[PDB]
Amino acid sequence: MAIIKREWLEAATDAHKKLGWKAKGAVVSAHDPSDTGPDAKGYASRHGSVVKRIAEGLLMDINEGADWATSLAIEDGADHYLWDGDGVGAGLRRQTTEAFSGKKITATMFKGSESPFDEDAPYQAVRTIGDVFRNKRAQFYYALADRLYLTYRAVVHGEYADPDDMLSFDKEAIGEKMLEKLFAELTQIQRKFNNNGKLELMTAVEMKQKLGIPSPNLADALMMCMHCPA
Ligand SMILES: CC(C)c1ccc(O)c(=O)c(O)c1
Numbered sequence: 648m649a650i651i652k653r654e655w656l657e658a659a660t661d662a663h664k665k666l667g668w669k670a671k672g673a674v675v676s677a678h679d680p681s682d683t684g685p686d687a688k689g690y691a692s693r694h695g696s697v698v699k700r701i702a703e704g705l706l707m708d709i710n711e712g713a714d715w716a717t718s719l720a721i722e723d724g725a726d727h728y729l730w731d732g733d734g735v736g737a738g739l740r741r742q743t744t745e746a747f748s749g750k751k752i753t754a755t756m757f758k759g760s761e762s763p764f765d766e767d768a769p770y771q772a773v774r775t776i777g778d779v780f781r782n783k784r785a786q787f788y789y790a791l792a793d794r795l796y797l798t799y800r801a802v803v804h805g806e807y808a809d810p811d812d813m814l815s816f817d818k819e820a821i822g823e824k825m826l827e828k829l830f831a832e833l834t835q836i837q838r839k840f841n842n843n844g845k846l847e848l849m850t851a852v853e854m855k856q857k858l859g860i861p862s863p864n865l866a867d868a869l870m871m872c873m874h875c876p877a
């Protein structure tokens with residue numbers, strides 16, 4: 648039921664260096680907030696197809712967490728910032744826009760439970776995006792998985808892919824310790840049964856309650872930065 652193979656993640660590590668291409672595009676950052684409790688904060692940032700920061704935030708309340716993440720976005724030179732606005736993050740827009748006052752950074756609330764982005768468009772690579780994915784969480788996790796798989800095929804099987812459709816982890820920038828944390832989370836993201844035959848993923852709650860593993864905050868952050876607002 649897992650959607651991402653560890654082998655793809657290994658291949659994607661420094662893939663831009665292996666295949667000789669450079670990060671090009673917008674810088675997108677995303678934050679997975681949490682209230683004070685067991686669930687850590689997540690932050691991820693990419694420059695185009697190259698992930699450059701993965702960070703985890705401990706011992707913070709929700710507002711401290713948002714301050715931490717917006718500061719990271721600023722440090723990273725983000726053009727776009729997203730955060731998880733389902734549940735506890737629903738009220739964070741005010742603090743977030745305040746943090747970016749005077750800066751050219753857009754802030755977008757990500758709601759993983761909503762219907763997929765552009766749900767009426769034909770599903771590519773009669774059947775629409777909305778027939779395929781239950782919600783945005785599923786849609787953007789599969790976008791991530793698709794990038795990783797294409798990168799794996801390019802790195803390991805020498806199959807050409809446009810760098811725009813790939814994803815590389817900058818190991819030097821991210822750090823080995825945080826990369827290992829991320830990978831342990833990404834390999835636990837799993838499909839759940841859906842009675843309308845759509846792709847749907849286990850929620851953070853189901854993951855910890857049904858099979859006792861910690862919330863994938865770093866993976867959720869990375870997944871949200873797959874969406875580039877405008
Ligand atoms: C209640 C728990 C498991 C939970 C719910 C929703 C989220 O968006 C989370 O990001 C999270 O880390 C934990």
Ligand SMILES: [Mn+2]
Binds near residue numbers: 679680731867
């Ligand atoms: Mn969340």
Ligand SMILES: [Mn+2]
Binds near residue numbers: 686689851867
């Ligand atoms: Mn979380």
